[PDB]
């Protein structure tokens, strides 16, 4: 798998938060 | 076929194929024996206390050592004032550490003490065992017990004998046995005692009949059919009953006066009191884990917390929408649960005014409740179309088990002490026994009449069950029948009949004895 | 009758309408996956 | 008005053959009789007792237990 | 008027409702008896009850009197026997129902049960 | 018999166990809209489909589109969903003087992504929705008679939670320790927070200048191509009917 | 007496609504069901115990149990 969740969770959460606004 | 549906669903879901406690325990054990032994037994109190205090001081927990010193000072203030004042490093501590305490004792007393300590190894006896081994040495002797007027002391005083090595070494027997009036192998003795004790266990059951039990009955008169609930305290000292007139009444089961912490009520003479404040019929009551707190619920939709020290309310909980039918403390008394008309189960803690967990899933009103002995699960049952039992997790708030099979209104629920069995009764006279882990019915008991079985109770070892019904009977059942040596089910040990008194409560004491309660109606 | 908040009903109706528009009445499967990612 | 302690009695009217009608019996009374009437008897206060329902599985024959004259034993 | 003076004068305004009834219904409603609750408060509550009942009674009498002198009783107020004696005013179900209808109560019954 | 999930399900365990299998869903994120792999249209972040993004943020199975997911045959891995997320997110309009190779010049101007893998855990609402859908799905006739719902749910629960903690404690400290040990990440959040509540001349000039404009005045826009799809459907039906004749 | 009173109320409502048909009676009952009789022994998706929907209660439970 690429971009496994346990290590990149914070970045994905930040981008999702920016998207939701 | 349900199996096909479940298999299809699972496949479609990707399922692959410290020291103070020990001292108090020792003191409590000591005062329980005969007065003969106590004289020699009291000699162990001081060495244990001093060595525990010194160990706590050395380990760096000076706070704990100070707490121990202040807590127990009153006990020894009349004997060792100077030593206690010194304890408030000097050569005294060095001398104590270098020389191990010497305490004389008898062989039979030593055996009894070792057996008692082994029996409670994990409860706190290990600390005393270690202290005695390390900082103490016992010089066992074959003489009789030493007392101011026993055979040994009288003989020694009269015949003008001499002290022994044990008697040689601030209370000393020399002041008593003088005219002015061996060692030990602990550790080895412990394994040795364990080996001897392991030989006397019972590991079977064949033939015979059930256990005989006694029963005591409490009857209430002139009630006029206004009593709705009943409950005994955990130690069987108080009884509380709720009525349809919205009040509650507590009695002393022995007739002794009740006491109030209020100074204005100093030494008042009354053996029954009233708790007022509900505006509707009271349906449930529960004594807390002596009991100082009480819970109650009524048809007005409220839960009230009362104080048994000042006899007044403290807080009101307002989470329900409609009547509340049952309320129960947790197995240890900080959490409690409730359930009523609005088809929901709520779990509270006494520190918060709002329910911490809410449990959805039932389709009709709740009619029974029960806690798990470990305090992390709850049981509930519904009526009418949805006659099922559910097991909820307090950590997540989800359902983990469902039990189906009942065809009548469910009246009582009970969980065994071992934590692996569950019992339930309905208005058809049936009693079901469930396996919690497998969610499977084990067996059914029959013999009770129609009407309802308000209460159930399990023996201390979870091998006997007692029930009370509205048909004026108390019955005893055997969970597992004895192995054969080669309308009523054959596992009913006994059955008693009351004189026109429906039974509302049964309770198992520590012994093979129970206490029941009910209301007498001449008609 | 059964009672529930109006907001939930309106939101569900809007979502169902949007999904029906997107999937063209179920004739198109927009959730299909090709390959192994 | 349904919590009264008075007995409930029904009259019987006859509208015709096989068509009876029933009505509540109610007679006018004077205020003197109601106001001057004595009060019912006060029952005694609530209390509780104790006794032994069974000793070692056997029921003693004491006044507080039912008589042996008058379903408690399997016979299969 | 003041609450303090009224409560002090409560000695002279005791209602006709016996203290036993007051204690019983206070306990039912969730209030301890006069020994733990100032007797003046209980007397005040009983006086309010008496005033309410007297108002209803006056309304019922007014309804009864205007009727006294078509001429058929209204359906839903079944009750009575021969019809009383002499020209005495009789407290009947109809007047009580008419009076309490103004207070939000409904006392409709059936006349014949069949 | 089927292997049962652990007490706490984590992305590591699910991703390791089911490695080498196709992902359940692929989502592409843009500046202001998102879509799936085979989707030709798009979804706006302000549209009703914001629930999917919220679920992705919270790592929860979206029970609200369960029937749509079922229709598409989306795979489940022990009740969870593996989702791949592709991150594409990271002149003078309305003037008649602009130039364009397909237009005359005009005389008034001089002259002419990161990738992620995540796991979504199941909930009780998902099971409720599953049973409800099974209740009203024709196959007896129906796929699940309601009266058997309790037994079916009991068996599913038995399969899901095969082992429990049925060991009694002896005092309050033991219960406290057991409660502390069994804590669950999904049920250990915190209590929420209380709910809370020069250029003017240019704006007024624009508002005045847009007077009596039927459509643009109100605004001072989510196309769906419904008329086009209706036309396509009717044309297909007419052609198919003409095939017979 | 309760049956009598219920019948009278429903009859009056139906008479005010509209000789009266069965549709008028059904409409009167439906209108009356909006503010009372929210109980009974209803089971699966039956409006008993207040009449709340299971999905809303599940949402509230999810919010609390977090």
Among all residues of chain E, which has the CA nearest to that of D2? E107
Q: Which of residues 156-195 of F touch B (CB under 8 A)?
A: 156-159, 161, 163-169, 171-172, 175, 178-179, 182-184, 186-187
CA distance B108 to B142: 9
Are β-strands F114-120 and F33-36 bridged in parallel, bridged antiparallel, or unpaired? unpaired
H or E element: which one contains B370? strand B366-371
Beta bridge partners of B505: B517
**DSSP codes joined into one string, B3-22:** HHHHHHHHHHTT----HHHH
CB F161 to CB B401 under 8 A?
Answer: yes
Contacts of residue D37, Cβ cutoff 8 Å, sequence gap at least 6: none
Separation in Å, CA of D25 to nearest CA in chain B: 29
CB atoms inside a 10 Å sphere around CB A2: 10
> What CA–CA distances, in Å, run from G35 to B462, F63, F145, G55?
51, 32, 32, 21
**Nearest C-alpha neighbor of B408 from the set B361, B371, B450, B369:** B450
Tokens for E55? 């108002």
CA distance E72 to B149: 107
**DSSP codes joined into one string, B420-442:** SEEEEEETTS-EEEEETTTTEEE
**Which position has the token pair 């008309």?**
B341
**Cα-Cα-Cα-Cα dihedral of B82, B87, B90, B91, to 10°?**
60
Cα B494 versus chain centre, distance: 26
Separation in Å, CA of B341 to nearest CA in chain G: 6
**Cα-Cα-Cα-Cα dihedral of B359, B364, B365, B368, to 10°?**
-70
CA distance B62 to B70: 12
**DSSP codes joined into one string, D5-30:** -SPP-B--EESSTT-EE--B------
Tokens for F120? 């979504």
CB F175 to CB B404 under 8 A?
Answer: no
CB atoms inside a 10 Å sphere around CB F131: 17
**Nearest C-alpha neighbor of B366 from the set B345, B382, B379, B378:** B382
The sheet that has D47-54: what strands, in order across it? Answer: B503-508, B513-519, B214-221, D47-54
CA distance B507 to B214: 12
What is the crossing angle of helices B62-76 and B19-30, to 10°? 20
Tokens for B424? 């339930």
Contacts of residue B156, Cβ cutoff 8 Å, sequence gap at least 6: B177
- Compute φ and ψ for D12, nearest 5 degrees: -150, 110
**Nearest C-alpha neighbor of B512 from the set B470, B476, B469:** B476
Burial class (CB in 10 A: 0-12, 13-18, 19+), B357: buried
CB atoms inside a 10 Å sphere around CB B158: 8
Cα E6 versus chain centre, distance: 24
- Compute φ and ψ for B214, nearest 5 degrees: -105, 165
> CB distance from E78 to chain G under 8 Å?
no
CA distance B427 to B448: 9
Separation in Å, CA of C5 to nearest CA in chain G: 8
Is residue F44 within 8 Å of residue F32, measured between CB atoms? yes
Size of interface B-D (CB pairs under 8 A): 80
- Out of B5, B388, B418, closest to residue F152 by CB: B5
Burial class (CB in 10 A: 0-12, 13-18, 19+), B513: middle
Tokens for E111? 């006349």
Tokens for E83? 């019809």
**Nearest C-alpha neighbor of B389 from the set F4, F133, F6, F157:** F157
The sheet that has B399-404: what strands, in order across it? Answer: B366-371, B377-382, B388-393, B399-404
Burial class (CB in 10 A: 0-12, 13-18, 19+), E75: exposed
H or E element: which one contains C2? none
Beta bridge partners of B425: B412, B431
Is residue B347 within 8 Å of residue B355, measured between CB atoms? yes
Q: How many Cα atoms occupy the beta-carbon half-sphere of G10 within 13 Å? A: 18
CA distance B323 to F17: 50
**Nearest C-alpha neighbor of D41 from the set F7, F152, B222, F85:** B222
Beta bridge partners of B424: B413, B432
CA distance B127 to B133: 10
SS (H, E, C) F205-242: HHHHHCCCCCCHHHHCCCCCCHHHHHHHHHHHHHHHHH
Resolution of the PDB structure in angstroms? 3.5
Question: Residues of F143-159 as b/e, b for ≥16 C-beta within 10 angstroms?
Answer: ebeeeebbebbbbbbbb
Among all residues of chain B, which has the CA nearest to that of E27? B276
CA distance B13 to B7: 10
- Compute φ and ψ for B73, nearest 5 degrees: -60, -40
CB E78 to CB D25 under 8 A?
Answer: no
- On chain G, the residues whose CB falls within 8 A of the CB of E109 are 1, 4
DSSP B123: I
What is the crossing angle of helices B19-30 and B45-59, to 10°? 180
Helix (H, G, I), strand (E, B) or coil at F102: coil
Among all residues of chain D, which has the CA nearest to that of B220? D48
Widest CA span in chain C: 48
> What CA–CA distances, in Å, run from B327 to B284, B295, B312, B367, B371?
6, 7, 19, 11, 11
Q: How was this structure determined?
A: cryo-EM
**Nearest C-alpha neighbor of B43 from the set B134, B170, B178, B162:** B170
CA distance B295 to B354: 16
CB G8 to CB E110 under 8 A?
Answer: no
**Nearest C-alpha neighbor of F150 from the set B392, B399, B339, B343:** B399
Overall residue count recorded for chain E in this entry: 114
CA distance B105 to B145: 8
Tokens for B392? 């909820």
CA distance C18 to F44: 11
**Which position has the token pair 């109809």?**
E94
Separation in Å, CA of F126 to nearest CA in chain G: 11
Phi-psi region of F20 (alpha: psi -120 to 50; beta: other; left: phi over 0): left
**Nearest C-alpha neighbor of B24 from the set B82, B71, B59, B60:** B71
Are β-strands B136-141 and B101-106 bridged in parallel, bridged antiparallel, or unpaired? parallel
CA distance B301 to B427: 26
Cα angle B31, B36, B39 (rounded to 5 degrees) comes to 65
Contacts of residue F196, Cβ cutoff 8 Å, sequence gap at least 6: none
Beta bridge partners of B229: B242
**Which position has the token pair 């079985």?**
B453
Helix (H, G, I), strand (E, B) or coil at G36: coil
CB atoms inside a 10 Å sphere around CB F15: 19
Are β-strands F33-36 and D20-21 bridged in parallel, bridged antiparallel, or unpaired? unpaired
Contacts of residue B301, Cβ cutoff 8 Å, sequence gap at least 6: B318, B320, B321, B322, B323, B324, B340
Helix (H, G, I), strand (E, B) or coil at D2: coil
CA distance F107 to F85: 50
Phi-psi region of F106 (alpha: psi -120 to 50; beta: other; left: phi over 0): left
**Which position has the token pair 């115990």?**
G49
CB D53 to CB B216 under 8 A?
Answer: yes
Helix (H, G, I), strand (E, B) or coil at F97: coil
> CB distance from F7 to chain B under 8 Å?
no
Burial class (CB in 10 A: 0-12, 13-18, 19+), F104: exposed
- Compute φ and ψ for B380, nearest 5 degrees: -150, 160
> CB distance from A7 to chain F under 8 Å?
no
Separation in Å, CA of F64 to nearest CA in chain C: 8
Q: How many Cα atoms occupy the beta-carbon half-sphere of B206 within 13 Å? A: 5
A and G make contact (3+ CB pairs below 8 Å):
no
Burial class (CB in 10 A: 0-12, 13-18, 19+), F242: exposed
Size of interface B-G (CB pairs under 8 A): 49
Is residue F79 within 8 Å of residue B14, measured between CB atoms? yes
- Compute φ and ψ for E27, nearest 5 degrees: -65, -40
Size of interface C-G (CB pairs under 8 A): 19
CB atoms inside a 10 Å sphere around CB G9: 14
CB B222 to CB D43 under 8 A?
Answer: yes
H or E element: which one contains D66? none
> CB distance from D40 to chain B under 8 Å?
no
CA distance B364 to B2: 24
**Nearest C-alpha neighbor of F114 from the set F7, F227, F8, F27:** F27
Rg value, chain B, Cα:
30
Is residue B249 within 8 Å of residue B262, measured between CB atoms? no
């Amino acid at each position: 798998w690429e971009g496994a969740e346990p290590e990149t969770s914070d970045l994905l959460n930040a981008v999702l938060d920016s998207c939701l606004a | 076929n349900l199996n096909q549906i479940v298999t299809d669903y699972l496949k479609k879901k990707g399922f692959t194929r410290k020291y103070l406690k020990a001292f108090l325990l020792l003191k409590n054990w000591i005062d329980n024996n005969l007065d003969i032994y106590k004289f020699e037994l009291r000699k162990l109190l001081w060495p244990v206390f001093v060595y525990s205090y010194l160990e706590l001081v050395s380990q760096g927990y000076v706070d704990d050592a100070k707490h121990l010193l202040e807590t127990l000072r009153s006990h020894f203030e009349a004997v060792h004032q100077d030593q206690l004042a010194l304890l408030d490093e000097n050569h005294t501590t060095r001398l104590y550490r270098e020389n191990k305490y010497r305490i004389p004792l008898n062989q039979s007393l030593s055996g009894n003490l070792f057996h008692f300590l082994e029996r409670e190894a994990d409860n706190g006896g290990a600390t005393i065992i270690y202290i005695l081994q390390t900082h103490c040495s016992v010089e066992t002797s074959a003489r009789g017990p030493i007392e101011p007027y026993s055979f040994e002391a009288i003989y020694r005083r009269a015949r003008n004998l001499d002290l022994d090595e044990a008697d040689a070494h601030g209370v000393t027997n020399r002041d008593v046995l003088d005219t002015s009036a061996r060692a030990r192998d602990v550790v080895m003795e412990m394994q040795k005692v364990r080996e001897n004790r392991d030989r006397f266990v019972i590991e079977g059951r064949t033939g015979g009949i059930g256990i005989p039990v006694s029963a005591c009955m409490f009857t209430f008169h002139n009630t006029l059919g206004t009593v709705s609930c009943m409950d005994f305290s955990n130690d069987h000292k108080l009884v509380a009953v709720g009525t349809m007139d919205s009040y509650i009444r507590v009695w002393s089961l022995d007739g002794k006066p009740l006491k109030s912490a209020l100074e204005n009520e100093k030494n008042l003479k009354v053996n029954n009191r009233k708790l007022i404040g509900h505006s509707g019929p009271v349906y449930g009551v529960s004594f807390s884990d002596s009991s100082k707190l009480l819970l109650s619920c009524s048809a007005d939709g409220q839960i009230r917390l009362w104080s048994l020290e000042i006899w007044a309310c403290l807080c009101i909980y307002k989470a329900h929408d409609g009547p509340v039918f049952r309320v129960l403390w947790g197995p240890h008394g900080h959490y409690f649960a409730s359930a009523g008309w609005d088809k929901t189960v709520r779990v509270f803690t006494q520190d918060h005014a709002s329910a911490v967990r809410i449990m959805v899933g039932h389709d009709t009103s709740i009619s029974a409740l029960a806690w798990h002995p470990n305090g992390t699960y709850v049981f509930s049952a519904s009526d009418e179309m949805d006659k099922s039992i559910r097991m909820w997790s307090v950590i997540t708030g989800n359902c983990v088990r469902i039990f189906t099979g009942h065809t009548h209104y469910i009246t009582a629920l009970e969980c065994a002490h071992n934590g692996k069995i569950l019992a339930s009764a309905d208005t058809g006279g049936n009693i079901f026994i469930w396996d919690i882990e497998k969610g499977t019915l084990i067996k059914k008991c029959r013999g009770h009449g129609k009407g309802g079985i308000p209460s159930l109770s399990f023996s201390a070892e979870s091998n006997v069950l007692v029930s009370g019904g509205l048909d004026c009977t108390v019955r005893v059942w055997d969970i597992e029948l004895p192995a054969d040596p080669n309308q009523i089910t054959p596992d009913q040990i006994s059955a008693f009949a009351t004189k026109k008194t429906p039974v509302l409560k049964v309770r198992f004491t520590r012994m093979n004895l129970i206490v029941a309660g009910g209301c007498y109606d001449p008609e | 009758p059964v009672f529930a908040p109006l907001k939930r009903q309106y939101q569900l109706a809007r979502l169902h309408e949007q999904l029906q528009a997107a999937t063209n009445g179920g004739r198109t499967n927009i959730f299909k996956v090709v390959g192994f990612g | 008005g349904y919590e009264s302690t008075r007995p409930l009695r029904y009259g019987e009217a006859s509208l015709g053959p096989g068509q009876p009608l029933f009505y509540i019996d109610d007679e006018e009374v004077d205020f003197e009789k109601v106001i001057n009437a004595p009060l019912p008897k006060v029952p005694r206060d609530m209390t509780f007792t104790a006794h032994w329902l069974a000793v070692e599985g056997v029921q003693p024959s004491i006044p507080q237990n039912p008589t042996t004259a008058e379903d408690l034993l399997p016979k299969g | 008027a003041s609450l303090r003076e009224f409560l002090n004068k409560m000695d002279d305004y005791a209602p006709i409702i016996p203290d036993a009834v007051t204690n019983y219904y206070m306990t039912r409603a969730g209030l301890p008896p006069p020994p733990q609750t100032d007797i003046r408060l209980a007397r005040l509550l009983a006086l309010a009850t008496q005033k309410f009942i007297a108002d209803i009674a006056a309304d019922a009498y007014q309804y009864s009197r205007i009727r006294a002198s078509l001429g058929i009783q209204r359906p839903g107020y079944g009750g009575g026997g021969q019809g009383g004696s002499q020209n005495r005013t009789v407290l009947t179900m109809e007047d009580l129902g008419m009076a309490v209808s103004e207070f939000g109560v409904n006392v409709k019954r059936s006349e014949f049960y069949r | 018999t089927f292997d049962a999930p652990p007490y706490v399900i984590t992305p590591e365990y699910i991703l390791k166990k089911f490695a080498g299998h196709p992902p359940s869903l692929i989502v592409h994120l843009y500046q202001n809209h998102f879509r799936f792999d085979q989707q030709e249209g798009m979804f706006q972040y302000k549209s009703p489909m914001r629930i999917f993004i919220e679920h992705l943020r919270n790592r929860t199975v979206p029970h609200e589109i369960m029937e749509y997911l079922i229709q598409g045959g989306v795979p489940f891995y022990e009740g969870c969903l593996i989702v791949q997320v592709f991150d594409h997110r990271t002149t003078v309009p309305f003037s008649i003087h602009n130039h364009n190779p397909y237009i005359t010049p005009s005389p008034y101007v001089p002259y002419p992504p990161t990738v992620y893998t995540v796991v979504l855990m199941p909930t009780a609402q998902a099971l409720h929705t599953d049973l409800l859908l099974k209740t009203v799905t024709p196959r007896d006739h129906m796929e699940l008679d309601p009266k058997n719902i309790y037994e079916v749910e009991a068996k599913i629960l038995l399969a899901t939670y095969p082992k429990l903690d049925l060991e009694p404690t002896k005092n309050a400290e033991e219960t406290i320790a057991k409660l502390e040990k069994l804590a669950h990440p999904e049920h250990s959040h915190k209590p929420p927070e209380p709910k809370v509540r020069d250029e003017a001349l240019a704006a007024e000039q624009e508002r005045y200048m847009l007077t009596l404009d039927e459509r643009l005045s109100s605004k001072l826009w989510e196309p769906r191509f419904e008329r086009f799809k209706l036309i396509e459907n009717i044309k297909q039906e007419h052609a198919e009917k003409k095939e017979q004749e | 007496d309760f049956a009598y009173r219920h019948t009278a109320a429903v009859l009056s409502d139906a008479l005010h609504l509209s000789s009266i048909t069965a549709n008028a009676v059904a409409l009167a009952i439906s209108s009356r069901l909006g503010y009372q009789f929210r109980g009974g022994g209803g089971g699966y998706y039956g409006g008993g115990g207040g009449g709340a929907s299971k999905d809303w209660m599940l949402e509230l439970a999810r919010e609390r149990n977090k």
